Amino acid sequence: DRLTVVKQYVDNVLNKASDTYHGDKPSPLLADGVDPRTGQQLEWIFPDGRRAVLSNFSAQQNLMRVMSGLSQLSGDPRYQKRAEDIVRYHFQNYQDPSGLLYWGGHRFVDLKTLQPEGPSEKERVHELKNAYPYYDLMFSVDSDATARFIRGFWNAHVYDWRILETSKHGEYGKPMGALWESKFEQQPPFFATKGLSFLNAGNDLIYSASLLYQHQQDQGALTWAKRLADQYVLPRDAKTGLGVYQFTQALKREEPTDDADTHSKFGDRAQRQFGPEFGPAALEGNMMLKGRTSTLYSENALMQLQLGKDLGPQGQDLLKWTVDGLKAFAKYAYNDQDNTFRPMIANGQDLSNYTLPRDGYYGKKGTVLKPYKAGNEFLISYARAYAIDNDPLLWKVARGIANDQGLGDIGTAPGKEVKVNMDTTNSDPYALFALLDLYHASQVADYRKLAEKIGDNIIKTRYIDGFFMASPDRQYADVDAIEPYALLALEASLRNKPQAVAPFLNGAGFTEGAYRMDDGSARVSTRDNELFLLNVGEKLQP
Numbered sequence: 119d120r121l122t123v124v125k126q127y128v129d130n131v132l133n134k135a136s137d138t139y140h141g142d143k144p145s146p147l148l149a150d151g152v153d154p155r156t157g158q159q160l161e162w163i164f165p166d167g168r169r170a171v172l173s174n175f176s177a178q179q180n181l182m183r184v185m186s187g188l189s190q191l192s193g194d195p196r197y198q199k200r201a202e203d204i205v206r207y208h209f210q211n212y213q214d215p216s217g218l219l220y221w222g223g224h225r226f227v228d229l230k231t232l233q234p235e236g237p238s239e240k241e242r243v244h245e246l247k248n249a250y251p252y253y254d255l256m257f258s259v260d261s262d263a264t265a266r267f268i269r270g271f272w273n274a275h276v277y278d279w280r281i282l283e284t285s286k287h288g289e290y291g292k293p294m295g296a297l298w299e300s301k302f303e304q305q306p307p308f309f310a311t312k313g314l315s316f317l318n319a320g321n322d323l324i325y326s327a328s329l330l331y332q333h334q335q336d337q338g339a340l341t342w343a344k345r346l347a348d349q350y351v352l353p354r355d356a357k358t359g360l361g362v363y364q365f366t367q368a369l370k371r372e373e374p375t376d377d378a379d380t381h382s383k384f385g386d387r388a389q390r391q392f393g394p395e396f397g398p399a400a401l402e403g404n405m406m407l408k409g410r411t412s413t414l415y416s417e418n419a420l421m422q423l424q425l426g427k428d429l430g431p432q433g434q435d436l437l438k439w440t441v442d443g444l445k446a447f448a449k450y451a452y453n454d455q456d457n458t459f460r461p462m463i464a465n466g467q468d469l470s471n472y473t474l475p476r477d478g479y480y481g482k483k484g485t486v487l488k489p490y491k492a493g494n495e496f497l498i499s500y501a502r503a504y505a506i507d508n509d510p511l512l513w514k515v516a517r518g519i520a521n522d523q524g525l526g527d528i529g530t531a532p533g534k535e536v537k538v539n540m541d542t543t544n545s546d547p548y549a550l551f552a553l554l555d556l557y558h559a560s561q562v563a564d565y566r567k568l569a570e571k572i573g574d575n576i577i578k579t580r581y582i583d584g585f586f587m588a589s590p591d592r593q594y595a596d597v598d599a600i601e602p603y604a605l606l607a608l609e610a611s612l613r614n615k616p617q618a619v620a621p622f623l624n625g626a627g628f629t630e631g632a633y634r635m636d637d638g639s640a641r642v643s644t645r646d647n648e649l650f651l652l653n654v655g656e657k658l659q660p
């Protein structure tokens with residue numbers, strides 16, 4: 119029984135991931151990772167060998183949504199209460215005077231000492247990339263502290279409000295500037311700036327300001343949310359409609375001397391590595407490569423489709439921008455013969471099977487850029503876009519992904535010649551989410567019946583030792599796993615209470631810094647993502 123499984127799972131998290139380091143006076147905070155076999159919590163190793171237990175609240179915002187949803191569907195308020203208590207504790211102890219939290223890519227809390235940590239000593243800064251925190255919960259606990267965070271986030275990460283120069287990181291302890299009252303002057307596409315306007319952090323700026331508007335009716339927040347979203351639309355290629363991952367280019371401060379030194383101070387990294395053969399259109403924002411296209415055509419799309427709907431009449435432009443881009447990506451990059459996307463430049467250039475002729479930001483010389491399989495995160499974004507605009511081009515991508523993923527044939531159109539694979543072994547929570555989206559818009563029973571099968575596969579093959587794991591051999595389970603989130607969304611659908619579970623935007627957290635190896639050496643740019651990929655007996659490789 120799915121709801122019973124999720125309740126048992128969250129009970130297990132609150133037992134095994136809890137603060138066991140302060141006797142009978144524990145904090146409410148949780149460890150990000152737990153070995154489900156032993157209960158060992160995942161640790162970060164600092165240069166002197168001190169071990170901290172990783173508690174990064176930005177990497178727990180799927181769990182927070184799971185706990186809220188579990189309380190809604192079960193009627194047991196203890197999970198909502200604990201999620202609220204964790205939020206309250208972070209505002210009480212881990213929010214600096216500027217409003218920023220000790221979370222994100224380069225800050226976390228040590229569950230043993232309850233001190234904020236900074237694992238990247240050259241980077242003791244605030245960083246959110248495709249995080250999408252559960253601000254709805256935070257506002258219900260403390261609306262002023264949540265608003266202070268969102269304003270402080272923009273205050274630290276907007277380097278120049280006149281031109282909307284943004285940055286993926288921000289400093290703590292900054293005084294508040296003019297914020298939404300700042301004067302703005304729109305600049306031409308790909309103006310040169312120091313700050314890096316990557317859309318993974320831009321996603322979090324747009325989303326947070328939109329939630330501040332939703333909760334506090336802050337019209338300045340909404341104006342700048344829409345303006346920042348527009349910054350990623352204005353530079354899109356005039357002919358293809360593709361792009362963009364960023365809307366500025368790196369300000370060239372020094373002449374480069376080595377291809378393999380990719381510091382942004384030497385200028386746009388794509389223009390260095392691709393400029394000689396491809397010309398001026400080779401800019402970082404225009405590189406439609408694996409990963410970048412997930413941030414653009416999945417994470418940004420999920421958030422903007424939901425925001426566009428929420429805004430009603432004044433969200434129509436946002437919906438058009440978002441769907442137009444997904445159409446362009448399908449038209450140029452999708453290969454329906456083998457369910458791949460072509461690596462591309464946004465001017466329409468195909469980079470399939472291109473061999474890199476020099477070292478650079480996008481790979482060593484000799485690297486071959488290959489078409490890459492379209493994963494289930496794109497099944498979600500194409501399903502949701504089709505619900506808004508019933509375009510057969512969008513359906514073709516959804517149908518190709520589902521077929522490639524072993525789900526069968528979702529039909530030539532919703533409900534037309536459906537032949538789904540009810541014996542599928544697929545256990546991907548992303549596929550479950552996408553099938554619920556196809557079902558919600560079409561009301562075709564077979565899509566939810568297939569979603570039930572995926573849910574049963576998730577329980578059968580990923581519910582292991584009381585936790586959810588991507589493989590039975592993984593060393594650590596992630597308490598932010600989205601398997602239980604998909605299961606709750608399925609239960610909410612079956613119970614005719616879809617609003618019981620927060621909309622899935624595919625956010626996640628990460629932690630990055632130097633990590634100490636057993637020989638005492640420093641492994642720079644280590645990520646907790648890497649720790650969660652280890653199997654039993656495996657260690658991080660240099």
Ligand SMILES: O=C(O)[C@H]1O[C@H](O[C@@H]2[C@H](O)[C@@H](O)[C@@H](O[C@@H]3[C@H](O)[C@@H](O)[C@@H](O[C@@H]4[C@H](O)[C@@H](O)[C@@H](O[C@@H]5[C@H](O)[C@@H](O)[C@H](O)O[C@@H]5C(=O)O)O[C@@H]4C(=O)O)O[C@@H]3C(=O)O)O[C@@H]2C(=O)O)[C@H](O)[C@@H](O)[C@H]1O
Pocket residue numbers: 240247286312316318380381382383409
């Ligand atoms: O595998 C993937 O594709 C990867 O894609 C995303 O991540 C990419 C990239 O892979 C990440 O490494 C990261 O890169 C950022 C910059 O592009 C990179 O050059 C590096 O930048 C550092 C500093 O972070 C940056 O602030 C600049 O710093 C200046 C100076 O060098 C520094 O010493 C000084 O203190 O501050 C200066 C300044 O403020 O300008 O430039 C530095 C440099 O070396 O150039 O690191 C950046 C970073 O950590 O954000 O993010 C990329 C991204 O697209 O976000 C994806 O997020 C990954 O998950 C993965 O998929």
